Paper text:
Connexins are transmembrane proteins which assemble into hexameric hemichannels (HCs) at the cell surface allowing the exchange of small solutes (ions and molecules of molecular weight below ~1.5 kDa) between the cell cytoplasm and the extracellular environment. The GJCs connect the cytoplasms of neighboring cells and ensure their electrochemical and metabolic coupling in a process called gap junction intercellular communication (GJIC).
Both drugs inhibited the Cx32 HC activity and the GJC-mediated dye transfer. Once we saw that Cx32 reacts so dramatically to 2-APB, with a substantial rearrangement of the N-terminus, we were convinced that the choice of 2-APB for our study was clearly favourable. Our results suggest that drug binding to site A may affect NTH-mediated connexin pore gating.
Author numbering:
A (entry chain C), B (entry chain D), C (entry chain E), D (entry chain F), E (entry chain A), F (entry chain B): 1 to 105, 122 to 221
Write the structure that this text describes.
């Protein structure tokens, strides 16, 4: 597991990506993966059982947890990580496939231009996915701090029982870490698009 | 774990598959595997215990869960993934075996034609398996949204107790993701069959 | 993890096995392993706790589960998989050992004949093990469908309490899959024996 | 993970071991490891909780389980596997060390003789360990069949409550498998010692 | 997994780091990782359930644990390990990227100087992160010894119930180990900065 | 995973260690690791829950377990294994670093002498750590046999309730195994120091 291998794997063997994607984006992906793993394995553990309510009627706890947490934070970050990693996977497979096609046997200039457009559009899609997940996170959970207690009131629960959230401060810390990682990813993606466009326009002149 | 190795592994070292199977189908397989892993490990966890009913007679919960969920979604997707991956496995083993037979020592043209027919029939079988699992999913679970509560009524359960489903919205989200992945796989398989047939007929002329 | 490596590993580097064992038998072994893993990890989970009875006397549930399920299906398939995989392991080790002995330094014709007989006898033993496990499965569990409820009556259980089986339809589906895989393995083993004998007799003439 | 690598790893790169140790002993070790893994992971699971007694005084179940099962079967087989595998590990390390010493720079004949004696004594120790564990198994658990129920009577338990054993028939099956594997290992070890001594004496003449 | 590979991986292939970072810092990182793994897997296990209170009102235990342990020690050390490992990751990626850029085709002297400044600033950031986490640990948990029992008093808990901490002495031991590892890391980082600055100034003269 | 690789990895690529450390010490480390893994995974499982007391006041069990078992045996052996393995890790990193420094470009004689002193001092530290952990084990747990029942009397526990220890005989067996492994490690370390000193003094003459 040498460093050249890990760097090449995270780079995607893409000859158009600049140092922002080669170094900073890959590092932040590693950082976000590690934080997500820690949060998933420890903080949001059996989150169904951790979320407790002062009630005795069966099923009241389950409905309240679904009502106040339609999607748990880790699952949303898991989906976000998968979705934003998909265009990178597509670009890597495209590069590998083009290498294979070349290996079977100018047209190479056309291939390079196609790869350039593919990478730029992939970064734009990655930026859009990050922005969409950020907006979804804002829509589901206003603010950045985990709620401590909630006043649940739903059909299986009579008398408007109140429920408590396990590890609220710890979850707030990890929420800030994940949001910060996503925000910096957005900044880097915008920087890559601008840098590539500027360099391409300068080369055109 | 270089990208050439992963691309070759997912391709099956099949010289007749086009860029649709080399790139798009493999990527969607990776995407579907990751979503399934997340859903299996977190969303559909101890699904037997999550599905709860407001009753005290032992065994009522188990029978109700079996009555309304004959096959849980993850198991159906697990079987679907195994079944649709089987023809790809068969083609890969056929290619490896033909390479071995050649390595022991025109007939190679006949081998190439046999591989071509094998791949085309394998894609047709993969398409049929995807369609069958899609129809089974429609038959077992009408619609695309997880039911929130059900009115169970079976022998161990008196008085027609009602049961609640854990994480209904989250399960709906993953259901849509899995259905979308399966649908795009169907589209790509049809495209590969049409593309191969068109190219073969053009070559015949 | 290239395809040549996986194909060679499953083949056993046996120069007498035909395409049936190289391709079809190995694929079905992979398929059976995957289905067994899914069934073991999810379907037959904590099968002791899943099997429930409407009784309060401690130990009644344990005795009833032992009385109606002397050996759980997954353990039987696990033992079956180990036993039927053993002759393949023996042949692979024999081939490796013969290569080592040759590497230390006609007699090679005698070695080839010994390997031929070893492979044929190994396939016969594999067929016998499959048939024996099939008969044992028939003897323990008549039919192919998991029982839904049973009327247990044993010493710790008074009043002949009835017990329920968790996930009966899902277990039936996996039972059919495992039985089908075993049946096709039997067919392929018979085909290999017949094909080898026919080819050997033809070569004798 | 080629077959030559696995065969070499299990052989210990020992040039004095005959085909019995290269092939049959290694295969039985693999078989015993797999059966032990299955038994440990499934059959003897939370064996403390599975062993149940019809009593309410806390700690009675724990003392009864300790009183009738001083050492659980899997732990005894785990210790047996470790102990009988230790001399093989010692021989492998000795061979590697001798290769290293040779690599630093007849004396090689003396080295070969020392390796021969080391291997023979290691096999004798392996045979003794197998016999000792077999005798211990006989001493702790007379017979070969798991007891179904026991009549416990110890200080925390009043009124001589009776306890039940979970999965008795399944445990009996695995016990027979493990005992059979150990017995065949004893036979093979005796055969190796006799074969080596006979061949050495014949060479002396 | 040879020693040269592990040493190179932990070194980051950085040609400016001295023997302090190559040897001592990497060893302490390994030591800290192992201690953290042991503490996470065993000592701080289901820490939510281990922390118990003599009360019956649901949710009181959860709020008390959050009130006295806003962030559990393992999570804080996990975040600390990730944060202090990040600059090392950045330097490694920078070195790999510079090697790639060189591989595409004095400027190399400028590259070496940039790498030198990058490494020095990274060590300073690593030192600052260690100091910040040390101060946070002091702020959250005064002293170095785990509290045995606490007198919780919060809204869901009436009558000021008292709670007990599981494994206090064991947690104290691991706390001292982790604090000692962090302290020595601080000392080594300061030593590296001073050594590099002294050597650079001497070279300037 | 060839034997040369494993032997080299456990040796540390140290050219001054004799056959005692190359072969016997490495083997005993492997043996101790395996026994510790078995004990940790099975014997000392959820040791908090296994240790039970005949009481109903919450938290009494936790305090009693902490009072009679300040540090559980597996954690002590885990810390012991980490601590005694640390000097071996330091020597391996030193050798790798010296190889790297040599690779950058008599002084080699000075390097060899420094490595010799480093190894000797490391063995002395390893011996001291083993002796210290042995004394700590004696201090915490007099004797070698696990206590069966204890008479706990602490603040949360009224009336001096008695507690029982799960699997006392099994834990005694593993305790003897671990103590024996540590004792033989002490003997081998003393032998290595004496052998190296004797050989060095003889070479001086
Ligand atoms: C610059 C940054 C964003 C690059 C991100 C690249 C990441 C997302 C890529 C690089 C290598 C990829 C991995 C390569 C191989 C596998 C094995 C496969 O069986 C599951 C997916 C998995 C694990 C891939 C997931 C996506 C992955 C981790
Ligand atoms: C174009 C797409 C559909 C190709 C899909 C290829 C997938 C289904 C193939 C490619 C490599 C294959 C894997 C190769 C090796 C192994 C190891 C074996 O012990 C279990 C099965 C497993 C894990 C295979 C499962 C099927 C697999 C993942
Ligand atoms: C044609 C078909 C039936 C061939 C079947 C071959 C199977 C049964 C063989 C091929 C490779 C073998 C594996 C090779 C290596 C190991 C590692 C060892 O530590 C445990 C057993 C295990 C995992 C073997 C189990 C048996 C195995 C999986
Ligand atoms: C002929 C038969 C009896 C040979 C038996 C050889 C077995 C016992 C040997 C062969 C290879 C050995 C393994 C080689 C490497 C490791 C990694 C180490 O970190 C733990 C022990 C472990 C897993 C060894 C355990 C013992 C082992 C499995
Ligand atoms: C001198 C000391 C401080 C160097 C510390 C280097 C450590 C922090 C570096 C060296 C190798 C790195 C690992 C290399 C590869 C991977 C795989 C990736 O999928 C997750 C992160 C992970 C596991 C990295 C984490 C950070 C890591 C462990
Ligand atoms: C002669 C005897 C005492 C030598 C003992 C050497 C042992 C203690 C050394 C040899 C190889 C080392 C391992 C090499 C690589 C890694 C990976 C790292 O991410 C965690 C630590 C770990 C697992 C090391 C732990 C210490 C280790 C196991």
């Amino acid at each position: 597991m040498n460093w050249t291998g890990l760097y090449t794997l995270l780079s995607g063997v893409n000859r158009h990506s600049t140092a922002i994607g080669r170094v900073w984006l890959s590092v932040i992906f590693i950082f976000r993966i590690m934080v997500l793993v820690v949060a998933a394995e420890s903080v949001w553990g059996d989150e169904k059982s951790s979320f407790i309510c002062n009630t005795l009627q069966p099923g009241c706890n389950s409905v309240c947890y679904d009502q106040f947490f339609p999607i748990s934070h880790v699952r949303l970050w898991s989906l976000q990580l998968i979705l934003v990693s998909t265009p990178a996977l597509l670009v890597a497979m495209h590069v590998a496939h083009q290498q294979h096609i070349e290996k079977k046997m100018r047209h190479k200039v056309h291939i390079s231009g196609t790869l350039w457009w593919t990478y730029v559009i992939s970064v734009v899609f990655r930026l859009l996915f990050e922005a969409v997940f950020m907006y979804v996170f804002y829509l589901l959970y206003p603010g950045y701090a985990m709620v401590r207690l909630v006043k649940c009131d739903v059909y299986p629960c009579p008398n408007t029982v109140d429920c408590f959230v396990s590890r609220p401060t710890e979850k707030t810390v990890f929420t800030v870490f994940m949001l910060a990682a996503s925000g910096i990813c957005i900044i880097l993606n915008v920087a890559e698009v601008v840098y590539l466009i500027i360099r391409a326009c300068a080369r055109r002149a």
